[PDB]
């Protein structure tokens, strides 16, 4: 449950370190890079959901500067996330990893763990930079 205005933390070494949401999309990877669409009224981002976001606060030196409109994917909800077995996960803090219109990450590494759902949701290479799934 991310919605616009909600700041997130950034899980990558691309220069940004603090993005504010600005839009919640409903698209994903689909053989031509990112799909468009899903409708235009979905109101909460879950892990594995793409969002758009302004880059409020960024590290000097580094590939993404403040004010940049950006398409991150969220990797860490404080909101709980449930599995088909019945397992639940929750992380203490909300965080996302900025990407580009192929879905590839923009930094050279991910920081902290990432939800296993990104593997379902086909972000095959953000999972690769990730120290742990779960």
């Amino acid at each position: 449950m991310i919605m616009p205005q909600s700041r997130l933390d950034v899980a990558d070494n691309s220069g940004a370190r603090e993005i504010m949401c600005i839009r919640v999309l409903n698209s994903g990877i689909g053989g031509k890079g990112l799909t468009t669409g899903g409708g235009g009224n979905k109101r909460y981002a879950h892990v594995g959901d793409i969002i758009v976001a302004s880059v409020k606060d960024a590290a000097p030196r580094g590939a993404v500067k403040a004010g940049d409109v950006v398409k991150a994917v969220v990797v860490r909800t404080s909101h709980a996330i449930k599995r088909a077995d019945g397992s639940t996960i929750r992380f203490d803090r909300n965080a996302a990893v900025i990407i580009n219109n192929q879905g590839e990450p923009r930094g050279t590494r991910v920081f902290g763990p990432v939800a296993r759902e990104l593997r379902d949701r086909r972000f095959m290479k953000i999972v690769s930079l990730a120290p742990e799934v779960l």
Partner: protein, 118 residues
């Protein structure tokens, strides 16, 4: 309504012992939940989760425990149904001395010296 004379809980208990699994006694010790991640292809990966246990909940096929770890500098909790087929088994790293049944207060202590006893 429909006032059949019947023991309701007994009928619930009887379609539920078949989905109940008993675990080693713990309270909030420390724990290795050696578990299963078959989401990795058609093959079965194994992973393990080790942290302080902060809650027991429910009864019968509804029992769950809440463990709480810190991976890579970011606090994480997780909730395991005892009779989940993705919980292979559980064992106690080390017993802890505590005065509650919950430990929610541990969430905002989040630091090395703010740690469960013995």
């Amino acid at each position: 309504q429909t006032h059949i004379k019947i023991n309701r809980g007994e009928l619930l208990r009887g379609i539920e012992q078949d989905h109940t699994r008993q675990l080693p006694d713990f309270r909030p010790g420390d724990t290795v939940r050696v578990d299963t991640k078959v989401r990795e292809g058609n093959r079965t990966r194994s992973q393990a989760f080790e942290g302080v246990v902060i809650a027991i909940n429910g009864s019968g096929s509804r029992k769950s425990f809440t463990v709480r770890k810190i991976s890579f500098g970011e606090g994480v909790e997780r909730v395991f149904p005892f009779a989940s087929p993705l919980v292979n088994q559980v064992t106690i790293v080390e017993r802890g001395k505590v005065r509650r049944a919950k430990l929610y207060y541990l969430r905002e202590l989040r630091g090395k010296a703010a740690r469960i006893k013995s």
